[PDB]
Design brief:
- By secondary structure, this protein is an alpha+beta fold.
- It has a single domain, classed as Arc Repressor Mutant, subunit A (Orthogonal Bundle), CATH 1.10.10.10.
- Helix content is 27%, strand content 11%.
- The chain has 3 helices and 3 strands.
- The protein has a 3-stranded antiparallel beta sheet, covered by helices on one side.
- The longest helix is centred in the last third of the chain and has 13 residues.
- The protein is globular and about 50 Å long.
- Interacts with BRD7, IRF2BP1 and IRF2BP2. Interacts with CREBBP in growing cells; the interaction acetylates IRF2 and regulates IRF2-dependent H4 promoter activity.
- It is found in: Nucleus.
- Belongs to the IRF family.
- This is Interferon regulatory factor 2.
- It comes from Mus musculus (Mouse).
């Protein structure tokens, strides 16, 4: 169980269910998951890869609520970045010059 769907279990749930075909476990056995991130829009204005997530932000983490205040996606995108600077077991791996077929995602490795 969990106290309030922390980001750890929130990511294990998103991936376990497969919310996006670009984000998933490359080796969930050792807790290794890679994300696609942005590969087209300089930043947003089109991120179907992380579009259904970027929204869960605010209403999720707990920094905003629709139907009460105004929405602000600017800071929401800054949160995802911290999601990588968090959990002291993640290892961002966007491949260098070996695993570069035609996507190259930020493969984050989580230690068990």
């Amino acid at each position: 169980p969990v106290e309030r769907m922390r980001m750890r279990p929130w990511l294990e749930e998103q991936i376990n269910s497969n919310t996006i075909p670009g984000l998933k476990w490359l080796n969930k056995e050792k807790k290794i998951f890679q994300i696609p991130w942005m590969h087209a829009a300089r930043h947003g204005w089109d991120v179907e890869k992380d579009a259904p997530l970027f929204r869960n932000w605010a209403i999720h983490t707990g920094k905003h609520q629709p139907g009460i205040d105004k929405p602000d996606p600017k800071t929401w995108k800054a949160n995802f970045r911290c999601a990588m600077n968090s959990l002291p077991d993640i290892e961002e791996v966007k491949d260098r010059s070996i695993k570069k077929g035609n996507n190259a995602f930020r493969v984050y490795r989580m230690l068990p």
